[PDB]
Amino acid sequence: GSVVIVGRIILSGSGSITAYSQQTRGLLGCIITSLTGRDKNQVEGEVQVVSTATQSFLATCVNGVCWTVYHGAGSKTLAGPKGPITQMYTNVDQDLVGWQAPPGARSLTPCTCGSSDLYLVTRHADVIPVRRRGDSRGSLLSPRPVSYLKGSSGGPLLCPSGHAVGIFRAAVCTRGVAKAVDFVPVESMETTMRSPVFTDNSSPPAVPQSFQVAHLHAPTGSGKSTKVPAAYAAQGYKVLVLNPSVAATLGFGAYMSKAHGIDPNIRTGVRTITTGAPVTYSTYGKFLADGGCSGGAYDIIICDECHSTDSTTILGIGTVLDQAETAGARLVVLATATPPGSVTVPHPNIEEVALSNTGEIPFYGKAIPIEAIRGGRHLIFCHSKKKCDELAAKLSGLGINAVAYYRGLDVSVIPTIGDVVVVATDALMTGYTGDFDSVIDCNTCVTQTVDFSLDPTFTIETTTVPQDAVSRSQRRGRTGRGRRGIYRFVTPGERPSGMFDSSVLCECYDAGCAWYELTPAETSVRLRAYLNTPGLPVCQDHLEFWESVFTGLTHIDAHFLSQTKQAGDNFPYLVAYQATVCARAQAPPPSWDQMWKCLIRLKPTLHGPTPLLYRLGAVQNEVTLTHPITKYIMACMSADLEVVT
Amino acid sequence: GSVVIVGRIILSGSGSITAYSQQTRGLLGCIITSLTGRDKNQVEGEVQVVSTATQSFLATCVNGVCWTVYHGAGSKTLAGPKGPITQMYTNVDQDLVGWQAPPGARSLTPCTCGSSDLYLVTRHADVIPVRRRGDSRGSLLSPRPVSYLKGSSGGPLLCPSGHAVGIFRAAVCTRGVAKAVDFVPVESMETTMRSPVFTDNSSPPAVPQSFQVAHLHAPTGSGKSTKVPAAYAAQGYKVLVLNPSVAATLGFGAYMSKAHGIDPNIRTGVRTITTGAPVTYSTYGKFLADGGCSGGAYDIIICDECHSTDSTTILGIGTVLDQAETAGARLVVLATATPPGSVTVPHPNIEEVALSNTGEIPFYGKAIPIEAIRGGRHLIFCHSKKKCDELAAKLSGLGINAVAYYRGLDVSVIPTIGDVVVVATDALMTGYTGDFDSVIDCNTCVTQTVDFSLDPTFTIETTTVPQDAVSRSQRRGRTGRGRRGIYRFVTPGERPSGMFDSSVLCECYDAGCAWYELTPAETSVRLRAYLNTPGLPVCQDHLEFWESVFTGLTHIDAHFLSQTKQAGDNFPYLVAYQATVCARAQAPPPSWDQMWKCLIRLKPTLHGPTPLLYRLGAVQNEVTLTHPITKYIMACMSADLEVVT
RNA sequence: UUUUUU
Numbered sequence A, B: 001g002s003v004v005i006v007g008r009i010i011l012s013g014s015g016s017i018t019a020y021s022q023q024t025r026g027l028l029g030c031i032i033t034s035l036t037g038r039d040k041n042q043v044e045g046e047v048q049v050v051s052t053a054t055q056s057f058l059a060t061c062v063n064g065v066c067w068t069v070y071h072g073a074g075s076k077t078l079a080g081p082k083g084p085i086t087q088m089y090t091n092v093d094q095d096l097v098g099w100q101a102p103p104g105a106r107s108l109t110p111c112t113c114g115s116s117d118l119y120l121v122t123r124h125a126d127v128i129p130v131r132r133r134g135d136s137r138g139s140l141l142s143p144r145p146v147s148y149l150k151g152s153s154g155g156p157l158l159c160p161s162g163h164a165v166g167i168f169r170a171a172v173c174t175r176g177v178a179k180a181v182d183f184v185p186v187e188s189m190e191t192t193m194r195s196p197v198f199t200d201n202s203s204p205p206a207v208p209q210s211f212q213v214a215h216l217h218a219p220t221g222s223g224k225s226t227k228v229p230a231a232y233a234a235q236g237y238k239v240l241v242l243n244p245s246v247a248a249t250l251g252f253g254a255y256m257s258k259a260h261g262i263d264p265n266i267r268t269g270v271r272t273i274t275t276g277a278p279v280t281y282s283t284y285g286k287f288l289a290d291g292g293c294s295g296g297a298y299d300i301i302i303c304d305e306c307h308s309t310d311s312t313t314i315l316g317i318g319t320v321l322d323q324a325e326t327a328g329a330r331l332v333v334l335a336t337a338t339p340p341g342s343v344t345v346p347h348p349n350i351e352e353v354a355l356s357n358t359g360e361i362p363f364y365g366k367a368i369p370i371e372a373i374r375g376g377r378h379l380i381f382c383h384s385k386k387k388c389d390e391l392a393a394k395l396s397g398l399g400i401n402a403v404a405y406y407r408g409l410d411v412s413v414i415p416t417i418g419d420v421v422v423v424a425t426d427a428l429m430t431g432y433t434g435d436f437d438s439v440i441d442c443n444t445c446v447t448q449t450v451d452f453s454l455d456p457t458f459t460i461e462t463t464t465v466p467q468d469a470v471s472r473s474q475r476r477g478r479t480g481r482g483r484r485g486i487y488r489f490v491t492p493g494e495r496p497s498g499m500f501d502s503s504v505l506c507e508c509y510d511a512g513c514a515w516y517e518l519t520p521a522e523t524s525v526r527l528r529a530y531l532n533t534p535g536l537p538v539c540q541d542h543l544e545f546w547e548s549v550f551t552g553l554t555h556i557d558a559h560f561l562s563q564t565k566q567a568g569d570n571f572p573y574l575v576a577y578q579a580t581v582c583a584r585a586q587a588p589p590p591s592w593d594q595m596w597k598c599l600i601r602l603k604p605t606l607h608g609p610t611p612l613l614y615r616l617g618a619v620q621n622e623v624t625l626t627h628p629i630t631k632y633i634m635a636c637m638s639a640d641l642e643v644v645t
Numbered sequence C: 001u002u003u004u005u006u
């Protein structure tokens, strides 16, 4: 899926700025060149209209480099003369990427005039007056529905003389009405050309004189969470180590005792073991449960797997980065083998073979030859538990030894030895360590996005989407470790890594409130520290908004919170709170799906419309918007919300 | 391009009904096949997954024919072995189309057990139990969000013994949750197959002995509006000719005397020329103002340009159909060059030439050579009346004699003789003969759609979209009327013809209340006559719903309504009604856009949040949802809304 | 941000 110039925006060269569009492709060579990656059309102008199979937006030439946004182009190559063109610059932290300017492409000159009267060119060749307010912010003179600004990410903010000031990346909205714009300044583009092409950090950082936050990018199985602590501790240092997976944390004492002769502390909600050693191993959950950091117990805190975008790890890291320095630590280390922007490379131990339609076993529109999985140990990733269950059952029906694994199931279901086909969701990763002769990958994930739907408030929706770079790589990575593997896939398609959704923030607050006695205010301090930190995965900054929502969720029914927590489903807080409001109102929940099971005893007692606070799934019952919490959350919706265009 | 088979759903041969999906084609194969209309892939199965360049849906083979929905496929060919296969059946009325099944495909057997326990097969191969409730309806046992049934159109509904009972076409919803499904019953396929493949309504209908509604289909500029009523008159009959356009209805006045030695009565708002001649011309608008049909006045009512789907035409045609027989008519003729299901075929008087990127005048991403309009008579369509102003001013600054026309301006602005470039909206799309050497066409237009967004009620949105087949053929047909002509265009395609949005039904009620003194109940009678008549454009049946809404909008401010009517913008009733509710609450309108100009003089005394009733544009002001009318409409949203998925 | 009753 290469990026393809499909047209251009003609700018005036003198006088008042005017623009008009010329379209050079009509889906013709578009979706086609989208693949070939060879663009036989000549590049004129300085503002390009670009498009992928799915998305269209803009790109701006400055200092002989074609620039656009990461959120829009990912790491995708640019189509041109000598086929696909690799990106020369890729800066997730700033939401900015750039290819080298193709034949005949002229650039704009960076604004030196320091003006505050700016103009935004959109993909409709509109020239929109913007009043600069910040270094990266400008107010609109005529507020517009956000929809008008869409497909315009990547377009230039010009000064009156027509010099590039920045590129458009996001709109600040009030109830979906764009009133300001966020942009990437040209100084960021300059800083990006001037950064060392390669920055090595494959090496355990020296313990700084004063407190440092440091990065550690090294491939899996390099001693990142084993050797590296065994060196630090060797130098008489106190090591805390935080990992996302209980299974992984536990399995450390036994290996550290082996290949490193230490008996470290292991902390989990399942098993605490205090051996009184310098090195400790704890999950993010457990670290959060223990209140975070405490009086100078550690000099080094490694955040293993710092790239995972689950609410638990995000919140854990944020607590570190905010506290470590005050807890008397000298070094914090953000460790990962797959930083943001990371891309899928071939791997030596792993042969990759696309599935076809020939096979005895239907699998996501393709098929799996039985000989490929009869005999051996194999791992098949499905996007849902129901799918795991269905395929495991079908395989058993064929006399193939097969088990389903997903959250709610105990690891024991997985045989550690002998022929097996394990059919699993991504939950495999947090609760099991072993590897397999091959991996078969459906290439899809289930994710959650927030929609600020105003009906009445917001909506959290679950959708099946193509996988991202982190997903392919960790799934493929369950084979070919210390031996030969095979990786079979349904699609070669991949997706940009490094970003997560606002709903994950929402999840962090929910968890702070449900599981850690964290105030929204406290959770903010910790997320703030995470967001303030370069190198990490990125999310729109909606802290104030989410903080404001959870703040007004007062006096929850403790019994309800207990039931939602135990049941273990998403948003136990928000689910329990909506349950509380309902019961107190003597009204029914949004529906009688299992999400609302904590209310089943009261079923005969509850009648009339639901006092709906927000949408966490299907709403079957009638609704009333008159509850004060509803109105409270409605008032929260009026805050500035930056959304990407 | 064509519709492409990109996969199939495989059904179980015995036992419980189960399904899985095979995907036979990626996206690249899809588009390439879509344009050559050449598909070599073996076709297997009774259920195909098909795709255009936009949507994807299903098609089911029955009795040797591969069937799907008109709302998905339009009248598109199906990519095949030798090349595109043209549809064999196109039944817009039943939302049903069919191609002769390619070799290899097999048919489902129709259900004759009359079982009322059914199973819907979705595009993701889920098998959803459904209880037959009517001939073409079934309730879902487990209601689901609409988005879940998306892309499942054309999929079969099967009885327990695996037969075909129908094909899915729409979801029947309550506040976004599908509780029932509408399908096209297998007996409509039989009925369709037992009427002929070719038909011709190209000759003027015989006056029948007893009352009849007939159709007249014949190419643009062939004599439908002139010769035909002249011939019927020449035979002793009294003819009423109803036309949507004021400019055409005025044209007929002077043209008919020299051309057919008839000087016809004329009725419009501006001119009510009476002659006593046996042919009366009238706009649908003046006809509605006059109160519709007057006893004994006419033998033949010609509803001219009945492809027109503006609200005045729908309501005027609906009025003829409900009234004509009782008023002593012998014959109602529905006349058009572009009936539902038709596509643009070559016109013997018209050469068609694609515009290119090369030329002096940028025109919608392409360009116009000034040499193509410098001499002669030319009509250029732009989507907006603003773009009309801009272009016509651009042209007038190049030595061209250009005039911009749209409604609001008088018909006199257009010179009848000598070189000219008229730059028009679709005020000049239909009916008009302005002796034009060439037509130049942006290929886009402006439409409104209703979204049932429950924030808090409904939303009417304006968007500019690619033109449909009626538009392309009608605009093009403004040239080459009695001679050779040139058609220049920006884009080659067209969307299917003969469908209109539910917002149009909303406009009819609005017009009924605003202009024609109709209660919402009276309006329903007329709209129902229209919806019950075969061969006319089709729409979702939201008649009960809209009527319920307008029935609750009482005690409007007659002053505001008088101003919104006079200003001539859309939804004068809805706008004035919202203005009424705001004024009485001393609250501001949703915004201060020109839509709300009737309230401008009151600005200094209006404060607080808008009691929002519905969304008719951007809402900038804070809103409150407590107003009784808002709740009345919210309760209206709870009725069954059939929506196509 | 396209028609018609003003």
Ligand SMILES: Nc1ncnc2c1ncn2[C@@H]1O[C@H](COP(=O)(O)OP(=O)(O)O)[C@@H](O)[C@H]1O
Pocket: B218, B219, B220, B221, B222, B223, B224, B225, B226, B227, B251, B252, B255, B337, B431, B433, B434, B435, B480, B481, B482, B483
């Ligand atoms: N006002 C007019 N001025 C000049 N020629 C006209 C006028 N009206 C009709 N004609 C001629 O009469 C023919 C029939 O026109 P019309 O009845 O409007 O065709 P249709 O109704 O099939 O589109 C046209 O081909 C055109 O040449």
Ligand code: BEF
Pocket: B218, B219, B220, B221, B222, B224, B225, B305, B336, B337, B430, B431, B432, B477
């Ligand atoms: F078909 Be004609 F242009 F009315």
Ligand SMILES: [Mg+2]
Pocket: B224, B225, B304, B305, B431
């Ligand atoms: Mg006509």
Ligand SMILES: [Zn+2]
Pocket: A110, A111, A112, A113, A114, A115, A159, A160, A161, A162, A163
């Ligand atoms: Zn400048």
Ligand SMILES: [Zn+2]
Pocket: B110, B111, B112, B113, B114, B115, B159, B160, B161, B163
């Ligand atoms: Zn049957």
